[PDB]
């Protein structure tokens, strides 16, 4: 029942600004402390800052590397947490999480101000700070044949090629096909461009007479592609 959904991530140029959002439900948001945490590429979790509750006058504390550039705020009437980031730099890039924050203090052994723990988390929103230009994906079929059938089941898919930055999402038949779907992690090319493959496993006997369409969404370039995937004529 607790749900946290961050959004607002994407590509921003060094020196730019960005506002992230986090919608919250399934708990008493108004009296909840809320924290932003980030994971830079290839690194671990990093505390960004936390905003407190009514009793503390909605006080905020910030990590040193972020002081004076980031502002955390909240709108209780709609249960939204925000992170406004200014003068972004490359090291700002990472996956940003918001977290419902509990407060703990042991009477007999505790030391003020006790400690804070992150009881619920969102899935994060990805921020990429780079001078490089956004590039939308080219989507190509990965067509089944007698070289990708496995008896009663066949693998077919889509190559989502040469985009920047991450992420792309891919679904099949508008999410009507969930079972059988496998989207492989992207490769990062020497060009600085990403490519990834998504495949779905379908009944072999259905090839040629049924429709399989991968829906590719790349928000940073405002591109959506619906690519129909068929067994190729005569090969």
């Amino acid at each position: 029942e607790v749900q946290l959904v961050e959004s607002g991530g994407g590509l921003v140029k060094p020196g730019g600004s960005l506002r992230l959002s986090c919608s919250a439900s399934g708990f008493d948001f108004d009296n909840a402390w809320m924290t932003w945490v980030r994971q830079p590429p290839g690194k671990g979790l990093e505390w960004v800052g936390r905003i407190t509750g009514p009793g503390e006058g909605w006080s905020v504390d910030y990590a040193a590397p972020v002081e004076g550039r980031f502002t955390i705020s909240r709108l209780n009437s709609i249960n939204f947490l925000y992170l406004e980031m200014n003068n972004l730099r490359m090291e700002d890039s990472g996956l940003y999480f918001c977290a419902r924050t509990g407060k703990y203090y042991d009477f007999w052994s505790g030391y003020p101000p006790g400690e804070e723990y992150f009881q619920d988390w969102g899935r994060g929103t990805l921020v990429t700070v780079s001078s490089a230009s956004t590039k939308g994906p080219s989507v190509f079929p990965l067509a089944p044949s007698s070289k990708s059938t496995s008896g009663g089941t066949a693998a077919l898919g889509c190559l989502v090629k040469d985009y920047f930055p991450e992420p792309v999402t891919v679904s099949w038949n508008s999410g009507a096909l969930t079972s059988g779907v496998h989207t492989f992690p992207a490769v990062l090319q020497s060009s600085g461009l990403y490519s990834l493959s998504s495949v779905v496993t379908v009944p072999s006997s259905s090839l040629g007479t049924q429709t399989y369409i991968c829906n590719v969404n790349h928000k940073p370039s405002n591109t959506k592609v619906d690519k129909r995937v068929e067994p190729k004529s005569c090969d």
Partner: peptide, 27 residues
């Protein structure tokens, strides 16, 4: 009346609270 008393309790500063809990143990 504990109904309204919880309301007010929510306006307690966590930092003040812990400082006070610590104080009554340590002193």
């Amino acid at each position: 009346e504990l109904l309204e008393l919880d309301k007010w309790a929510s306006l307690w500063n966590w930092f003040d609270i812990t400082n006070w809990l610590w104080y009554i143990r340590r002193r």
